[PDB]
Structures are given as structure tokens and as C-alpha cells.
Amino acid sequence: FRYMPFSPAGTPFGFTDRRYLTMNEVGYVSTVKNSEQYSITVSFFDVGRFREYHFEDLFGYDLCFLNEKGTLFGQSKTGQIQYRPHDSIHSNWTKIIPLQAGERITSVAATPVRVIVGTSLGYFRSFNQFGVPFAVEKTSPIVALTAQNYRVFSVHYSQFHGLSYSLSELGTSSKRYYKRECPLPMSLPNDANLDYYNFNPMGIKSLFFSSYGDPCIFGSDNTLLLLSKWRSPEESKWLPILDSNMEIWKMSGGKETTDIHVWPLALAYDTLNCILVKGKHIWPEFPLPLPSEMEIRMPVFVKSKLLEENEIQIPVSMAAEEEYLRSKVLSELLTDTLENDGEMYGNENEVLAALNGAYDKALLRLFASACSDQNVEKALSLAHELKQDRALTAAVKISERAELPSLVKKINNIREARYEQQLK
């Protein structure tokens, strides 16, 4: 098996002399064949903060990672890396990674405080932002890396397990594993886009931490997978939180397309930052379109049922189910973040509060429909899933309006049962 150099949201050359090395919420990095050398351009989406620049690449960098403080470059064969801070205040530094016979650098990553290099033999080399090495580690062969602050999300490959992943923190003292080589349930690729899968065999279009710090991955099935409960080894689960194919289908008024594709940049709370690629190839081209936003949606919608109820219009009762699930997942994730790491941007507490509000509201709609169909048992089960005591009260009012006195008493018991815990 041939290990190919990986970078988040990178594109292949195809029939041209240019491609994107990497791509995310910060900006994009492209390279152009310049006779026997290369022209590298580093652009930004926030033109106010950073200034787009370019330079000549005499090494042939095929690896890249972009963050808000700098850009990391890598050469898969010679093992030469370079870190270039965005501000001219700090100096560039260059390093050559030692490589054994046949060993290639497969992925690099950088945060404002950490620089990471992974190889095909499973060598894991870390540095600080200045190039001071911390420790060399031997793991399973690495195929993909991403990082955020002090945390590292790595993808590994063996001929035994297939794809696995590790989740670690590079603290001041030592490297600690949250998760060590656990199964990575990403669908592998099973053609017009063959050039891409020669360039990216695993089909990992991109991978990243969300803004709130949860690992995400986006494969050839165009489904955003998010790792939930990663702080509890026995509770960790991968969640499909967006079928971009289904969202495109809904945008097109329920019509099948072959010329609209999604290229993942980042996940911010509930919104997937991406490029909407229109054309024959599934990867973005030149010039790069403006980034689009795609709200995440739990994959619980059926195409046949969506057509019957008719951009595709969703019936309130059907949308309430998805919103309930979507709120449930997001609420659980964000709460875990706040209960362990605290705030990062300054609006998490407000987001969580609004989130729980939307949760109960969507749940009450499902409750009402259950009451509408005289389904007391299903309604009572829904009421148990309510969060706010004020929502239980609202449920009582709905039960009264539905003229279901038996339901009212049972919900009032729930209220009293919760009030009971309040007296302890």
C-alpha cells in the first residue's frame, strides 16, 4: 500500500500545473508549477487581519497546514519542513526530518504552540512554534493529522485493523492519550474522479477539531462524522451529523445532481464552513469561490417522504423530530465541553441556553402531535425527555387542551418527582 501525503482539503493537480495544498476557515494555500520550481500563495478569508502573500518554493512542498498564527510546509520525500508565522515580527524556521528507506512524511499539523510531523513508519515528531523538539514517538503508520492548541487528532492505518485514530494532549510535561488507536468507522472509497483517489486513497477530504474542540472527519461518502464523548473512553461514539449529499438534494428542490459538490473547511458550532464546487470534478478550482455555510442536519429524512409533503419544504411535525435530535446531540456535546474545559469564545453559555430552549420547544411539538393522535403512551414518553420544568408545565397545558386528564396526572407526577429531588 502506498502512503500519500495528506493535507486538509487539499486538491490534486489533475491536468493543470496548480492545486490547493490545504484549506480551512482561516484561508487557503495554493501552489503553481514554475518550470523546475514552484510558486506558493497563502491567502486569507479575513482580508482585514492578514495580508495575502506568496513566495518561491525550491523544494516542492506537497504538505501543508494552516492556522491563525502561521503556515506549516512539508516535503514528503526529502523530509524538509518550514514554519512561516503570518506576522513578520516572528522569524521563519526550517528543519529537515530524518527519514529511513522508503519512509515518507504523510501529514503535518501546527497550532500556535505546537508543530507536528507524522510519517509512514509511524514516527511522531513534535516541536514548539520555534522548532524546539519535544519528543520522538513511535506509533502505527500515520496517514492524517490535525491539531488544535495542545490537542492532536491522528489517523492511523495497518494491514490488520484498517483505519484507527488516536486522540492526545501535548501538555507541558508529557503526551497523554484520551483515545489510543480506537476504530475509525469512516467509509472507505469503493470513474471521473479517479485522479483524486490516486491522490487521496482513503478519501479523507478533510478532518479537524470543531470550534468547540470535538474531532470531526469528512470522507468520500460526504458525511460529516463527529466524535462524541471522547473524554470517557467507554462512552465515545462517532456521530453522523450531516449528509451533505442529502442537503444538496434538498437545495436543488429534490432533484438529483452530478455537478454540485461539498468541500469541507471547518465546523463552527452547528454550521459547516465549506466550498460549494460546481462542475465536473468534486474538488474546488481556480479561482476559489466564496465560502458557503451549510447547517448540520441529523440524517433522519427520507427522500420519498420529503417528496410527498411537497427548495424542499419540510412539514413542521417532521422538522421537529430532526430539530429535537440535533438539539439533543449539540446540547450533550457542549455541556461536556463546559463541564470539563470551560469557555473558549465567550458565548458558549448563551449558546447552550438557547440550545436547551430549542430542544424542549421541538420536543413539545412532537408531544402535541402525539396528543393529536390520542397517543397518550407516546406523549408521556416524550414528556420524560423534557429538560425544563417550565416545559413540563407547558406540556400539561397542551394535555389539558387535548382533553387528556389521564396524561395530565402522569405528567404532574413527573413534576412532583422532580420537585422531590429539589427537596434533597
Partner: peptide
């Protein structure tokens, strides 16, 4: 069943 009035009441709390 309309609950729009009930939902609004829950938000005001």
C-alpha cells in the same frame, strides 16, 4: 392542535 400561544408563553419565562 395549536400551541403557538403556549410556546410563546414558555419563551417569556
Amino acid at each position: 392542535i395549536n400551541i403557538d400561544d403556549i410556546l410563546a408563553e414558555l419563551d417569556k419565562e
